[PDB]
Amino acid sequence: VIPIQHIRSVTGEPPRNPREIPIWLGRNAPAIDGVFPVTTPDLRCRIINAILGGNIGLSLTPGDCLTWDSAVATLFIRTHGTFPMHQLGNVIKGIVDQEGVATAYTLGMMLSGQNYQLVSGIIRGYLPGQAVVTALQQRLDQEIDDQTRAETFIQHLNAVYEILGLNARGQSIR
Amino acid sequence: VIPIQHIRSVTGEPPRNPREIPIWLGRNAPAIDGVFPVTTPDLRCRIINAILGGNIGLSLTPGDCLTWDSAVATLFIRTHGTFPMHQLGNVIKGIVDQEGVATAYTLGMMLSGQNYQLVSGIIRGYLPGQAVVTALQQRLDQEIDDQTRAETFIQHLNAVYEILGLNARGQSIR
Amino acid sequence: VIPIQHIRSVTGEPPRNPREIPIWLGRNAPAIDGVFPVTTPDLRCRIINAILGGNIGLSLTPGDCLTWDSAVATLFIRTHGTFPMHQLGNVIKGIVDQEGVATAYTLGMMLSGQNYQLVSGIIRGYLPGQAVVTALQQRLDQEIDDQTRAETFIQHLNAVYEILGLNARGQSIR
Amino acid sequence: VIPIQHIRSVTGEPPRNPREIPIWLGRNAPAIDGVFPVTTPDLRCRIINAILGGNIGLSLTPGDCLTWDSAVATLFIRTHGTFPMHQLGNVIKGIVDQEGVATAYTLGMMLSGQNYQLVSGIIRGYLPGQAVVTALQQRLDQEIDDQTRAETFIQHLNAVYEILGLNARGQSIR
Amino acid sequence: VIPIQHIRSVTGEPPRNPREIPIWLGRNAPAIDGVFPVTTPDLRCRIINAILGGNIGLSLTPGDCLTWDSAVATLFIRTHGTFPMHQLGNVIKGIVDQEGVATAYTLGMMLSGQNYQLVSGIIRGYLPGQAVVTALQQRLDQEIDDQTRAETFIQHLNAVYEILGLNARGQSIR
């Protein structure tokens, strides 16, 4: 017996519009990993199919549930009909206005197969204000390599936002 | 003590209109099998009667709960009043517009006692577009026998839909 | 610790109108017995008092909870103010229109202290159509005795309804 | 880990108006004792603080949770601002119209520190009809002492109400 | 498997407006500690991230979850964009009108890093009525030192409010 109700308490009911189901799963995925440990592709497939309830159209098989990124990407092709990387710039722009830059980096990297150069370049255009772009680049440039920059991107954004008095959604205190 | 609440988290509350209770059970049946193992006809009868709550009219006895298909079919005769195979073409046409082709194959086969020839022929008429009909037939024809075609029908539909840029409900990206 | 939440998942919240609380408990009683075994009068009293929540007026003591029938009957005297058998014909007529004949036989026998002759005679008047009355009587008459007829009444109604194409609520396919 | 969810299934969400929180706790207290055993003042304090959720204003300390009566009385001084016994007659009159006489005896005795003479005298004025007052007094007078009358008051009200055809809220069948 | 559902029963769903999420966590924090014991910074981080569900913007790392005060303060900088102590007087004034003085002392001390002198001085201005200010000061002055006054502040407010017939929100009985 998989403990579905604890997982259902963290996630909640699926979104009504089929198009917003892939983004929802990506945002709730880190919290699920902390509350319950998922160690095999088969366990992940059973949890995702139960959370979405009776959606035969969006059912996933054990092969496509190797990593959380693969599961979120497959749901995108079933809900939208296009592979994600073809229109990544538009998808990141929608998340930034509705949720914020930190949500866009996490979901953009899941859909982009962990490509730091493409995600960092697209996000830099939509960062809030000229000062934020210059300050963040200086801090990231000091890091030794692309792997180290990828791990510390969210930590370096939070420090810059705090100095300039911006909330998570980028709205100024003034 | 059967763990009803985990099963209730996956399913949800029964539909208010008595006519849509049989289709609802069919869509939620695969997810229930993954979360909790059902191994006997008696266990299935107790789970179905609890999920529908206090519906004395639609109660099922252990004899008619031998397989999930038998349980869904018996509810159809109590909710609608006609055996399913008498009007299968109309039932499949309703599911395709509301949910999609993949939901119609799974529920059509449960109501049709696993008849591949009748279900495949009815679905081919309602497939979206002339190109989808020709492409799917070529892939299915290559398979060795009817049992092998039945197992791979959903896998071969998903590949064709992805090439032609169609979502699960059959709506084009254009 | 009694497992109240599993029992609450099957039942649901009590009805707002005090008059419909006795019928609600009768319909949900068979499902509760399957999910959790109730073996003593004391356990039944604790479960019924928790399900109704904080209703001091309708609280039941261990003495009146000997059988599910005794508990449903006592709630009727507290909600309505009259003993049930005094107005049984009217109560059965209300259930038949709202739910169906099968619900009326189960709840009519609980309120009537398992009297087959009174319940069968009252139901025969409200059966749907002249043909249903004649067909059911022929099948019941063949049975050896009143105990055997009481066990097989619902099974013999379902067979007659299926032949004449009627749904559980008695509405014809035509 | 205290099993809060089973206790939350019996109780429900707290009332929005701060004034009706003390009466709500009193009505739900007997059911909680049956489902889960509370044996220490500390356990009671932890359960009451969790049920009311995040109400820092109405938080209770282990010292004032010695008995369920002490906890309900302390919430009355925080929600209303006056000790209960100062205005007991008005409080009992409100409960009788909204819920009934049986709810008023149970909650009146909790707020009145188990004083039979004051609660019985206040209730006798608001009993429904002249006949109910005379019949109940005759039965209570036969009992040997005040402790015996206190235990059998609700049992003797239910018998009188049944003979005169009154529902729990005191409304006649006519 | 962390028992998230018991914690979710005490807390409830997060507030929709991002600005009121920090105050909500502070009010629900004492109840969570009683129901489930939290002994490590890592366990606290996993519980807070699950309770807020899928909010990537307000996610907290193990380093900033050393104490409940540190977690509530970090959420304030992400939701509002300013450190709390810069505008403490305004924050305490909002809580006093909406909830009461007792909620303002508990949340004011969490945001102010346990500074008794600043919190006590700000609260004294917003206490209800001239008599309450004089009576409370006399009782607090008798205590030996600032640590002893901090522990007994809520106990000494409740005694003064009871003598002057005030409810928790400061509204008089008159």
From TrEMBL, chains A, B, C, D, E:
Localisation per UniProt entry: Host cytoplasm; Host nucleus; Virion
Domain of life: Viruses
Main function: Involved in capsid formation and genome binding. Shortly after infection, interaction between incoming particle-associated Gag proteins and host dynein allows centrosomal targeting of the viral genome (associated to Gag), prior to nucleus translocation and integration into host genome.
Protein name: Gag polyprotein
